[PDB]
Amino acid sequence: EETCFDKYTGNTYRVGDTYERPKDSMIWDCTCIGAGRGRISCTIANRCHEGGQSYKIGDTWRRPHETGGYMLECVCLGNGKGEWTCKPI
């Protein structure tokens, strides 16, 4: 069985396993690819890292609008671009 070991999580994964790796004050979405080299690919392209937190696609959060009169609700869209959008509450 081909595996990947992640030195941060301390776990051994099989090919195709996905998992979270907290690092750099963010959360990386990692995949054990293997490829005969214990190849791991990790990405934040489908997370939003905003207001010091890590959000998955569909997660929401709040931040004040620049005018200060009202709050925004934001949602993480991802789109391989860490895309998020916010509407007034």
Binding site: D6, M26, E50, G82, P88
Partner: peptide
């Protein structure tokens, strides 16, 4: 009245057994 943006967008590939 709203706001939108893009977070840091990075992909890392590591060969743990090169």
């Amino acid at each position: 009245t709203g706001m939108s943006g893009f977070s840091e967008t990075v992909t890392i590939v590591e060969d743990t057994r090169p």
